């Protein structure tokens, strides 16, 4: 939230943790259109502190603030050998994340016995 208050650039980070061995891939897609390395970077692959079993890497994307009034959902796609389809696409936008207002509206009826 602090970075978004500067209205300059929000950076989305994609963590690929617990993977072994190295050389795991990463790519960013905006609305299903491939994202080049001009606008994104990846941590060269790395190692873990408590367990030596798997190593970690990271990737961060750069954008503007007006872009986070529409989202475009900025999917982070990965490619590693220990994957069924070598793809584990994940995406997060403003709609998901931490919400600031819950209103549960549980109703109780004596005749809504088959939730239509």
């Amino acid at each position: 939230r602090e970075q978004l208050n500067l209205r300059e650039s929000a950076t989305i980070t994609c963590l690929v943790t617990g993977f072994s061995p190295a050389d795991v891939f990463v790519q960013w897609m905006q609305r299903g259109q491939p994202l080049s390395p001009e606008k994104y970077v990846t941590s060269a692959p790395m190692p873990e502190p408590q367990a030596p079993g798997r190593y970690f890497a990271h990737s961060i994307l750069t954008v503007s603030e007006e872009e986070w009034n529409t989202g475009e959902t900025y999917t982070c796609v990965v490619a590693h050998e220990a994957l069924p389809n070598r793809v584990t696409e994940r995406t997060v936008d403003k709609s998901t994340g931490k919400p600031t207002l819950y209103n549960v509206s549980l109703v109780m009826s004596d005749t809504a016995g088959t939730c239509y």
């Binding site: 209205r7 603030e65 403003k94 819950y102 549960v104 109703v107 005749t111 016995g113 088959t114 939730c115």
Partner: protein, 103 residues
């Protein structure tokens, strides 16, 4: 305007979300969580056998929300009813939900 995040029909939870378009201010927006559980209040323990105690607990973990309380309107639930008419006993399939399914 609201994305249908969950439309569970066996526990009847209807979780969803949206982004409320506030004024043209810094992005102190609000994300919505319109969860809408409906309580049957008159169903049984198993949904498909009217012989058990009725219903005290109503557990809703929204992580296993993407045994049931309610009845699916497009599904059919039936049972074997043991009728006799004398000596023979033709155990025949009854209907616990007349109108959601037809023979």
């Amino acid at each position: 305007e609201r994305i249908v995040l969950v439309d569970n029909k066996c526990k009847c939870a209807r979780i969803t979300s949206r982004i409320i378009r506030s004024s043209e201010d810094p992005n102190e927006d609000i994300v919505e969580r319109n969860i809408r559980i409906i309580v049957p209040l008159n169903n049984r323990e198993n949904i498909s056998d009217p012989t058990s105690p009725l219903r005290t607990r109503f557990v809703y973990h929204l992580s296993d929300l993407c045994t049931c309380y309610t009845y699916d309107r497009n599904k059919c639930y039936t049972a074997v009813v043991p009728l006799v008419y004398g000596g023979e006993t033709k155990m025949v399939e009854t209907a616990l939900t007349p109108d959601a399914c037809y023979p």
